[PDB]
Amino acid sequence: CRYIPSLPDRILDAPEIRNDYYLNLVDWSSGNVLAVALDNSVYLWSASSGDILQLLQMEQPGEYISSVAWIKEGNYLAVGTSSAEVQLWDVQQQKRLRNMTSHSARVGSLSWNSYILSSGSRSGHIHHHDVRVAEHHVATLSGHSQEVCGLRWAPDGRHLASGGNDNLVNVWPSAPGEGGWVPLQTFTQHQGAVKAVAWCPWQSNVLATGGGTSDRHIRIWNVCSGACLSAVDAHSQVCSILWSPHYKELISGHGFAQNQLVIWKYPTMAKVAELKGHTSRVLSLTMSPDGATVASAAADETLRLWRCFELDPA
User: Fold this and answer.
1) Buried (b) or exposed (e) across 274-304, using 16+ Cβ within 10 A?
2) C-alpha distances in angstroms, 88 versus 3, 131, 132, 146, 307?
3) 274 and 252 in contact (C-beta within 8 Å)?
4) Exposure pattern of 138-163 as b/e (b: 16+ CB <10 Å)?
5) What secondary structure does DSSP assign to 266-280, as a single string?
6) Which class in CATH covers the domain with range 1-314?
7) Distance between CA atoms of residues 214 and 33, nearest Å
8) Are 147 and 162 spatial neighbours (Cβ–Cβ below 8 Å)?
9) Paired sense of beta strands 107-113 and 95-100, if any
10) How far is CA 233 from CA 86, 211, 247, in A?
11) Phi, psi (rounded to 5 degrees) for 18
């Protein structure tokens, strides 16, 4: 019922972006900098100044970047690699502070909870890293039998959600429950990979997840009771989901055939808009600090920036 532009505001070139569904290659910092992994390099783009930086480039051949994630205050960036490293970079002084090497396979997903960085791997394991201490690897969470492609701490820090190529969603506790590290909830209802994982910013217990091409559903959960609150058929893979508190909506990214973004009203899941423009499948979504703009990265080697959640479009 409001004006939503049908075209992106800006389009950034993303040459050589790796078209691998399971990877998480873009993140928009709280300081308004986009980190974008392009093959074996990471670029930073300031959305304020337009300045670009090539933060790093991997030396070894055939190696590639598999994930990026900014720490909450946006001055450090975690970078997971095909060679199973979780690197942390001080971007201001453009140097690598640590090269953490606990995983046995590529690190495709990352999520911070204050000074804890959690990393998910193609082996199906999740490691917690206390980045402040000598022995960084402080927990192993083992609840997936295939790649962990979705990993997300809740904004309140009380739960961690993980989604896997084994068609599984796990909700983990913030501390082990003296049965060891065991999920509080495990959902099997998706019949395809779950890369899309996102917590409701205004309801602590509400989680949204999305299934890949074999599944094509967005599901909303109450992680306390385990109940599915809602399930909707998106008619396409769902690669990412974000929530927006501006009008209480979610936005999802999709592939074949329309490669579109859909904005859904919460909780009715009424369609508010479809944003078309990409010419190959969307891979990731990330939100600006003011929440007005979503960046979508796609296999067409673009990032499109959509000002779709402006308060006061005028």
Assistant:
1) ebebbeebbbbbbbbeebbbbbbbbbbbbbb
2) 40, 9, 11, 25, 30
3) no
4) ebebebbeebbbbbbbbeeebbbbbb
5) TTT--EEEEE---SS
6) mainly beta
7) 34
8) no
9) unpaired
10) 35, 10, 22
11) -80, 115
- The region that residue 16 occupies, defined by phi over 0 for left and psi between -120 and 50 for alpha, beta otherwise, is left
Per the CB < 8 A criterion, the answer to whether 232 and 217 are in contact is yes
- How big is the CA angle at 5 (ends 68 and 308), to the nearest 5 degrees? 40
Contact of 90 with 77, CB cutoff 8 Å: no
Nearest to 98 by CA among 125, 127, 130: 130
- Cβ–Cβ < 8 Å for 26, 36: yes
Q: Under a CB-based contact definition with an 8 Å cutoff, are residues 293 and 306 in contact?
A: yes
- Record the resolution, in angstroms: 2.0
Domain boundaries, the chain: 1-314
Tokens (6 digits) for 174: 């913030």
* CA–CA separation, 205 and 212 (whole Å): 23
Cα-atom radius of gyration of the chain, to the nearest Å? 18
